[PDB]
Write a protein that binds this ligand. Sequence first.
Ligand SMILES: N[C@@H](Cc1c[nH]c2c(Br)cc(Br)cc12)C(=O)O
Ligand SMILES: N[C@@H](Cc1c[nH]c2c(Br)cc(Br)cc12)C(=O)O
Ligand SMILES: [Fe+2]
Ligand SMILES: [Fe+2]
Ligand SMILES: [Fe+2]
Ligand code: NI
Lengths: 231, 228
Amino acid sequence: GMKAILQLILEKRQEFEKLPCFEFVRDETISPEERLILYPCIAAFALNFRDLNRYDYRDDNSSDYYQKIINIHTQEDAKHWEWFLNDLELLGFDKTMRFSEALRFVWSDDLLHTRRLCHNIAVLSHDLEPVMKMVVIEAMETAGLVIFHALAKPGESIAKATRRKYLYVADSHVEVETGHTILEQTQLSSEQEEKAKEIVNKVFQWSTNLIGEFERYVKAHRSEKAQPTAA
Amino acid sequence: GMKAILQLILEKRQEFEKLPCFEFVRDETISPEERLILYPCIAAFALNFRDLNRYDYRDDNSSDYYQKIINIHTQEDAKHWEWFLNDLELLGFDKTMRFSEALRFVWSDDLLHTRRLCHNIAVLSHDLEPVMKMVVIEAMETAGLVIFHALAKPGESIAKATRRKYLYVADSHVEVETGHAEQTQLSSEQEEKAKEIVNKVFQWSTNLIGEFERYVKAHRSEKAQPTA
Ligand SMILES: N[C@@H](Cc1c[nH]c2c(Br)cc(Br)cc12)C(=O)O
Ligand SMILES: N[C@@H](Cc1c[nH]c2c(Br)cc(Br)cc12)C(=O)O
Ligand SMILES: [Fe+2]
Ligand SMILES: [Fe+2]
Ligand SMILES: [Fe+2]
Ligand code: NI
């Protein structure tokens, strides 16, 4: 019943792992600077995700024991945007630009699905019982681990070659997200099972659409390789 | 019924019009450059609002009378973000910064209610039938009109003085929003939901104006720098 759900996520993860974008990010025959062309795209997601954790997932005024554990989970994930901004700078992507060019970049029509992923999760999850909220978090954290397992490859390559401490496209981020059960010990209704199926499918479809935009961005911006600096 | 709902919107607008922010923005004893220091704050709202119209409010495959009305409405409101970026440039607020400084500005804790107003409206409206979305939209458009009625006062003073065409903090924008800001029978359940909708929209709009007020106080020297 719930075994079915944890199992649908593993099936979804194994499909997600095979997307062309990940084959590209893992390709060691391509400079890591070329593979991380997609890095600024994450700007449309990373601060929205911080806010999802802080304001949508987290509920400080709850006694329910499942919301209590969600709150602890959300507090750790709400710190990773700063790591994003750390590696933005190291990769040479923290460029000077007009305020309006920064805005037109984030709200690019080419980053629609990247930008609205967190919005879609909030609308999905706003009227969910805490145990259905945990499924959302679990599916989203599974998609996240796949993406960062991949990006930490070019990332750790640049970190060692330049001798700099990367925090976002880094083993240390993967390790914390590995660190990220009670869902084993939980029983779902037929209703709660059908809902959880709908959730897992939507999260993996929305993450697939975001990865699709990263792949299109690399192909559109082939010249704009990372420009990291050595020590 | 629907009658009292429009009366509530009217009462909330009369309340909203008299916030300190708007007394400040309307104060012709202060330079219009100072009355527009809130302007860059709208960056957290204007592009979100574009996306609310394009992606949340709009549903092209609908025969529902009210949704067809909403579709036409949303198509106009979804163009106003370019006007925002036009006047950002004219006001001297389109400055060169690090990408990260732009992100930290928009995702400022000081602009939380500004940034999430559209998110709150999306969450509130996502399950509503089109007649009830119309209530959400009328409330929001009414609050919009109050704000732009105020901002166009220093806006047009700067446009005339500099001989440049302002599009956002300008009478031409107010003219569109005047058009935007019917008689239906609502279940008692709907009348109740509609009253909750009007109360929430004017509360979240009041919170946003609150942040503009705080920003102006904290950045009181950062006046607009238009050129003639
Ligand atoms: N560990 C990520 C969270 C994450 C979780 N899910 C993600 C997806 Br789907 C796409 C992207 Br890009 C990022 C995530 C973070 O720290 O921002
Ligand atoms: N006429 C506005 C729409 C709008 C409608 N409601 C608004 C509120 Br509440 C605050 C702010 Br700032 C803007 C609005 C626009 O074109 O961006
Ligand atoms: Fe993370
Ligand atoms: Fe407008
Ligand atoms: Fe409008
Ligand atoms: Ni809902």
